[PDB]
Amino acid sequence: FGAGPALQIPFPMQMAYRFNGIGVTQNVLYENQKLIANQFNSAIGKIQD
Amino acid sequence: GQSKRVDFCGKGYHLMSFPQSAPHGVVFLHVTYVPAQEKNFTTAPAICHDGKAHFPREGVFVSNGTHWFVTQRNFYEPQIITTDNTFVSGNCDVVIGIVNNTVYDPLQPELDS
Amino acid sequence: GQSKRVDFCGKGYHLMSFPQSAPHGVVFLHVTYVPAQEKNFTTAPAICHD
Numbered sequence A: 001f002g003a004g005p006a007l008q009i010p011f012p013m014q015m016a017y018r019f020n021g022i023g024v025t026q027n028v029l030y031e032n033q034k035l036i037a038n039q040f041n042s043a044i045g046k047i048q049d
Numbered sequence B: 001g002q003s004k005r006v007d008f009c010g011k012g013y014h015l016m017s018f019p020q021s022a023p024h025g026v027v028f029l030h031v032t033y034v035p036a037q038e039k040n041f042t043t044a045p046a047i048c049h050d051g052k053a054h055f056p057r058e059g060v061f062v063s064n065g066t067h068w069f070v071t072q073r074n075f076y077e078p079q080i081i082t083t084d085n086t087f088v089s090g091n092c093d094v095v096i097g098i099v100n101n102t103v104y105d106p107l108q109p110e111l112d113s
Numbered sequence C: 001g002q003s004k005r006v007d008f009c010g011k012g013y014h015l016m017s018f019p020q021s022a023p024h025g026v027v028f029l030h031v032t033y034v035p036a037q038e039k040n041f042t043t044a045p046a047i048c049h050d
């Protein structure tokens, strides 16, 4: 959305792209989706605290 | 050079730049690539072949309603999903959104004839 | 976007960021990837086959 028209994508499928962008394959996110989501939520809560 | 920094050298994916002298300054003409004419497709994190999960190597799985193709994420170039397009990373039990489809083997038809 | 600049947007491999307005400023929440639970292995530059 910052380089042209906004192209919709599911958030897990976008986190897959952002994992690929750092050198980690897509299956790492897809197989550990629940753990990654829980870690993200816990990190946000700890930021608030 | 070509910069990957977002919005550093123009709105869009930077292609190149041209300098021009101006009174007491410089003028950069930023030539950039902007996507256009979007189209909506049904997508899938992975495709479940026989007892295996296939993820696209460099691309994304889309569907035109009936068939499943693998394309590049920045330009609609649908390709038939084969073994060279994807890679196997286990079975179809841990991926949420895995879709049943056939991955065509590029070697077996030639070997059988 | 996603930046490959080191330590520009957090300690680790940058994944994403979220802006939040604050009085007379902006607060970025940087979501990054950090390796953990390392293990030792024996490595080799190349492998000689036939």
Ligand SMILES: *[C@@H]1O[C@H](CO)[C@@H](O[C@@H]2O[C@H](CO)[C@@H](O)[C@H](O)[C@H]2NC(C)=O)[C@H](O)[C@H]1NC(C)=O
Binding pocket: B064, B065, B066, B067
């Ligand atoms: C989705 O794409 C597939 C593959 O291109 C289309 O199937 C082909 O359609 C063309 C055009 O009618 C036919 O000549 C081919 O014989 C079809 N191939 C097969 C294997 O059936 C399909 O029609 C497309 N679907 C939609 C809804 O556009």
Ligand SMILES: *[C@@H]1O[C@H](CO)[C@@H](O[C@@H]2O[C@H](CO)[C@@H](O)[C@H](O)[C@H]2NC(C)=O)[C@H](O)[C@H]1NC(C)=O
Binding pocket: B048, B099, B100
């Ligand atoms: C994709 O194909 C697999 C083939 O195994 C399907 O899994 C079977 O689904 C049937 C119907 O629900 C069950 O009776 C079988 O027990 C399943 N087999 C196994 C080995 O799990 C799966 O449901 C298909 N997926 C979709 C979305 O249709």
Ligand SMILES: *[C@@H]1O[C@H](CO)[C@@H](O[C@@H]2O[C@H](CO)[C@@H](O)[C@H](O)[C@H]2NC(C)=O)[C@H](O)[C@H]1NC(C)=O
Binding pocket: C038, C039, C040
């Ligand atoms: C990998 O091996 C290194 C040594 O090559 C380990 O480093 C040792 O760490 C212990 C515990 O702190 C120290 O007592 C040793 O003196 C360290 N050795 C050296 C040579 O510095 C390291 O812990 C190993 N890593 C893992 C994850 O097992």
Ligand SMILES: *[C@@H]1O[C@H](CO)[C@@H](O[C@@H]2O[C@H](CO)[C@@H](O)[C@H](O)[C@H]2NC(C)=O)[C@H](O)[C@H]1NC(C)=O
Binding pocket: C048, C049, C050
């Ligand atoms: C395993 O490594 C050894 C050591 O480099 C290789 O043995 C050499 O083989 C060549 C070719 O026959 C001989 O000229 C050398 O004298 C051998 N070296 C020694 C120290 O005996 C061997 O080829 C390697 N095997 C494979 C399959 O790569």
Ligand SMILES: *[C@@H]1O[C@H](CO)[C@@H](O)[C@H](O)[C@H]1NC(C)=O
Binding pocket: B037, B038, B039, B040
């Ligand atoms: C389909 O794509 C168009 C652009 O071609 C987009 O504006 C629209 O929101 C999409 N329709 C949906 C998501 O239902």
